[PDB]
Swiss-Prot record, chain A:
Binding residues for Ca(2+): E188, R191, D193, D196
Protein name per the record: Pancreatic triacylglycerol lipase
Gene: PNLIP
Catalytic machinery residues: S153, D177, H264
Assembly information from the UniProt record: Forms a 1:1 stoichiometric complex with (pro)colipase/CLPS.
Regulation: Inhibited by bile salts, is reactivated by (pro)colipase/CLPS.
Origin species: Homo sapiens (Human)
Residue intervals of the PLAT domain: 339-449
Enzyme Commission number(s) from the entry: 3.1.1.3
Curated annotation (Swiss-Prot), chain B:
Protein name: Colipase
Secreted found in the keyword field: yes
Keywords: Digestion, Disulfide bond, Lipid degradation, Lipid metabolism, Secreted, Signal
Species in which this protein is naturally found: Sus scrofa (Pig)
Family: Belongs to the colipase family.
Localization (cell): Secreted
GO annotation, cellular component aspect: extracellular region
Amino acid sequence: KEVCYERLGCFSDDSPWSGITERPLHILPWSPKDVNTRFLLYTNENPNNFQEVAADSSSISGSNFKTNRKTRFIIHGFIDKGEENWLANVCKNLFKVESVNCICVDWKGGSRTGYTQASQNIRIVGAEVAYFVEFLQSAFGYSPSNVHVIGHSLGAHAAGEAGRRTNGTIGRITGLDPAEPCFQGTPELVRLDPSDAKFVDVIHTDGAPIVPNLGFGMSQVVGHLDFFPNGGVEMPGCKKNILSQIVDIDGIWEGTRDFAACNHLRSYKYYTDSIVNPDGFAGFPCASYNVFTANKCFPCPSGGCPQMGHYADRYPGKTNDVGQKFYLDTGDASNFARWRYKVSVTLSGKKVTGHILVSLFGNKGNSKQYEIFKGTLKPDSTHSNEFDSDVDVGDLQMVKFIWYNNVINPTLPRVGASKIIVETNVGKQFNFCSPETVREEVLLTLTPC
Amino acid sequence: GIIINLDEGELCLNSAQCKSNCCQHDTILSLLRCALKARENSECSAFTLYGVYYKCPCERGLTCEGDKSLVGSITNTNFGICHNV
């Protein structure tokens, strides 16, 4: 039918909301006291124990909420076992680098149900956030431009609603892996899309298809920037879920079935690491992760790479188009960051078969040995490779060259490297030269020329 | 049979098993798995006999100069830092 609620207004049942093929079943949104959006507030001044605020002055007024610093709300969606704390941890890192009103949005009550109910109840958490956002603005004159909504799985689409209702005056929505079922290819109204804020940037990570493959994340581009880490579908570190042409989404969602949620949880783990690593995730404009891995988009263009996650607001062309894809590789854990380097090597010495490896040394550290080529090491031939250094070395000072093969080498041959050029991802080229050659498994230091 | 080629992180039982023969486990009680070899200037373990290290041996052509000390030391813990030569 239609249904109206105190404060939030009325929630229709029409197509697109319901009826259309992706979301056929007519369900309407549980009511606001049933959804039960709580806003738990964390700030620099109360970092680790929240204080519950709400859209009225007798709540905001004594609290650490401050109108002279930004507010960014973290809306959950799928919460894995153990993962309850994740919304807080995003706050804890914001505090390591900024003064912020970090409001985590809770709506466990609306989310613990069938998926389709929750897809629907997303609408209430959407108007809830828009209500608080419009509130600070009338109550206190606080522009929406200071507001940032971060939402994961369904939450993404909650933030998408919130922004929609604030009529895209919200500074930024960040979708961290917008759930797919009931939203992909569904119209903009029903889902997160570039118009829900002044800037929307999304991190796809589990973009496989949900059926047959349990690809919980959307794959469709929905932001002005869509970063696809590790090619937006399998993440290093993450076990893959086994196939099924009949997937129980409600079962996945309540937790009756099994689910390697890893690929979907990774977008907020990347976002969290991003806060404290501000060059560590640079997204290269490729046109696919395959072109990208085939070393063809490198370095960043003229006016940067965008940082995936937290720092993407700083990329100067972020709203020049919608749906701009960017690729990058991350770690498989811990500090997720990575810095990519292209190094070319020109061979000097004998023709041999072997592996050439290079290793960089710079003002702030040194990489390990990354293989550049395998097979016939022909003198005066060049070879190139792009690799993901788990270490930013700083500006390079020297490089080292080394080769080997698994055959006893009778001649005791000697290969070395005439010049070795390192191109940073920003694109600075550093040159290194040597007249020496060296024996198998000896480290030939090159130095600037 | 013999097991060969296990990747970074796979559980292992001696270093031969690992593509970068270093089957590591910090702590005596831990479940030993293939680790990467040490970079230049990080900590290392000297080359052992027991095929499972606490700290990996160094990557190619670095020496891990620490203290290959007496028995005791060498019957378990000799560490060092990979240095070039």
